[PDB]
Design a protein around this ligand. Structure first.
Ligand SMILES: [Ca+2]
Ligand SMILES: [Ca+2]
Length: 104
């Protein structure tokens, strides 16, 4: 699975369905420009055991929450929305799943 198609209300908050299978850890990124060779921008940061959206001056209010991960329902302006799914016993064994949105 390389992409996940999900449905939500355009421009309103949406808890993203995590496509990572059992025994995989999830981390959310934007892949800049949807270009494989480009940087991955991490969307959430852990502080004192809780996760919060990184306040990028540019990204705006795209990330509504990291408890749970919640976006405004739209494609990111800066690139693709990607979750990295990492196997619980081998962090070098992972697969990235791009999330794309249909609108209701
Ligand atoms: Ca990617
Ligand atoms: Ca073993």
């Amino acid at each position: 699975q390389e992409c996940s198609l999900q449905s939500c209300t355009q421009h309103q908050p949406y808890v993203v369905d995590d496509p990572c299978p059992i025994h995989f850890y999830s981390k959310w990124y934007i892949r800049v420009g949807a270009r494989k060779s480009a940087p991955l921008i991490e969307l959430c940061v852990d502080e004192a055991g809780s996760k919060s959206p990184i306040q990028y001056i540019d990204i705006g209010n795209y990330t509504v929450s990291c408890s749970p991960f919640t976006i405004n329902c739209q494609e990111p302006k800066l690139g693709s929305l990607v979750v990295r799914c990492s196997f619980y016993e081998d962090f070098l064994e992972y697969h990235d799943v791009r999330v794309v949105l249909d609108f209701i």
